[PDB]
Write a protein that binds this ligand. Sequence first.
Ligand code: HEM
Ligand SMILES: [C-]#N
Length: 124
Amino acid sequence: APADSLYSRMGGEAAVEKAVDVFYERIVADPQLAPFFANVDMKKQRRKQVAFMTYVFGGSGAYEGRDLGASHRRLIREQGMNHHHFDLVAAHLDSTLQELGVAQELKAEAMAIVASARPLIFGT
Ligand code: HEM
Ligand SMILES: [C-]#N
């Protein structure tokens, strides 16, 4: 049932779009992460992140973006992207969801789903 996904329960599109917007305002202010995004079109990147999060939170049928591993392979191989950056990024999202008032159980579910992206991203 549409209402029963994590996506729907956390407030659906308005909630995910707001979370992604705040998430990237924190990331571009973070000296440890901002250099990775300094020449990225952040309007397009926000849209891509909304689409990905919507998919893994159960809000869309089938992801139409690029494979996560392929999308970050160049960053890991040539720009020093590493597991510590992943932890920093995850913590920005957790703090964002907390600030936006996401219920603790839903925040835990969302963040476990983000944790599941780690092997995908690093090709482990
Ligand atoms: C923590 C979970 C993460 C998720 C869910 C995630 C998800 C995504 C998605 C969906 C895209 C767009 C791919 C596309 O369709 O083109 C992307 C691109 C990108 N990601 Fe991540 N990512 C994560 C971690 C990171 C980390 C740790 C870094 C570096 C600190 C990072 C840096 C980037 C950059 C710079 C791009 C844009 C690359 C480009 O277009 O040139 N991501 N990510
Ligand atoms: C990756 N954002």
